[PDB]
Amino acid sequence: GGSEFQVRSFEEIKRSGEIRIGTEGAFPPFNYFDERNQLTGFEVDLGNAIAERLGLKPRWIAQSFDTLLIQLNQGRFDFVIASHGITEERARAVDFTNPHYCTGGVIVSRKGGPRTAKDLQGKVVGVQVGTTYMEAAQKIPGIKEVRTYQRDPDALQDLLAGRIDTWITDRFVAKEAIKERKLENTLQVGELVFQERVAMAVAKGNKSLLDALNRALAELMQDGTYARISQKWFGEDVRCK
Ligand SMILES: N[C@@H](CCCC[NH3+])C(=O)O
């Protein structure tokens, strides 16, 4: 169907009455397509709450993770909410909001496998393209091979199939994958490889929208909306401390 690409200021957005939100749709329980193929998750609930507070109809676009920030800067959407940890490198190309959650990257292996970064000496480590996991895997010494996947759930599948020794992913993502697939007795979560603060992105320089997102997120944090949505997905409050 195609769409009109434009980096829009908040005033232009407000004038149209709708806001375009980019996400991935392959990172359960943050953003994913459910069993009746509808987009949902923590970040989808958060984005819709933000849109509602701002008085705007949300329009969601799911696309592959590796080009979300690319297509954001090209004008495909107004902001992205797709679990991006804030990094110096990414901040050169997009502006981040205040983080909407805090989390960490974690080692996951089959029951007898690697627990610590040092255990990764000589091992095959699967990670998703363009992630902070692939960043940290490239910097852990003595890994035999970093295998990079287009989608995070496919790295998990290669771990289950015994084609890699370890999968590095988000701690909440690993937690829920194991539960929902009943792999408590087959997978083992190891140590936290790093910690990160995860934020929404807008196109480099889009301060007016950045301001409006930061104001809405603060209100959701203060008025109880954030707390309900976090409790809904995690049974705990995941905001940054
Ligand atoms: N939090 C990680 C993963 C993002 C989502 C990848 N499916 C990162 O910032 O790279």
Q: Quick one: which atom of ligand 1 is closest to the CA of 131?
A: 10
E strand or H helix at 103: strand 101-110
Residue 110's beta-bridge partner residues?
Answer: 187
E strand or H helix at 174: helix 171-181
What's the one-letter identity of residue 238? V
Ligand 1 within 6 A of 170 CB?
A: yes
Q: Quick one: which atom of ligand 1 is closest to the CA of 130?
A: 10
Distance CA 34, CA 11 (A): 34
- Count of beta carbons in the 10 Å neighbourhood of residue 154: 14
Number of domains observed in the structure of the chain: 2
Distance CA 134, CA 176 (A): 21
Q: Quick one: which atom of ligand 1 is closest to the CA of 170?
A: 1
Residues 209 and 95 in one domain: yes
Residues 153 and 138 in one domain: yes
Calculate the alpha carbon distances from 209 to 31, 112, 146, 166 in Å: 22, 48, 37, 39
Q: Are 198 and 32 in contact (CB under 8 A)?
A: no
State which of 149, 152, 170 you would mutate to test the pocket of ligand 1, scoring each by most atoms of that ligand within 8 A of its C-beta: 170
Residues 12 and 92 in one domain: yes
Residues 227 and 181 in one domain: no
Distance CA 194, CA 181 (A): 25
Q: Are 10 and 212 in contact (CB under 8 A)?
A: yes
Q: Are 133 and 140 in contact (CB under 8 A)?
A: no
Distance CA 143, CA 152 (A): 19
Calculate the alpha carbon distances from 42 to 70, 165, 190 in Å: 23, 29, 24
Residues 80 and 191 in one domain: no
Q: Would you state the structure tokens that stand for residue 59, as one six-digit string? A: 């329009």
Instruction: Give the experimental resolution in Å.
Output: 2.0
**Residue 47's CATH number:** 3.40.190.10
Give 25-85 as a DSSP string.
SEETTTEEE-TTS-EESHHHHHHHHHHHHHT-EEEEEE--GGGHHHHHHHTS-SEEEEEEE
Whole-number Å distance, alpha carbon 230 to ligand 1 midpoint, is: 18
Residues 155 and 72 in one domain: no
Residues 155 and 77 in one domain: no
Q: Whole domain around residue 240: which residue ranges?
A: 1-101+200-241
Whole-number Å distance, alpha carbon 4 to ligand 1 midpoint, is: 27
Whole-number Å distance, alpha carbon 128 to ligand 1 midpoint, is: 8
Residues 122 and 186 in one domain: yes
Ligand 1 within 6 A of 230 CB?
A: no
Ligand 1 within 6 A of 152 CB?
A: yes
Q: Quick one: which atom of ligand 1 is closest to the CA of 134?
A: 10
Domain end: 184, 199, 214, which one?
199
Residues 56 and 152 in one domain: no
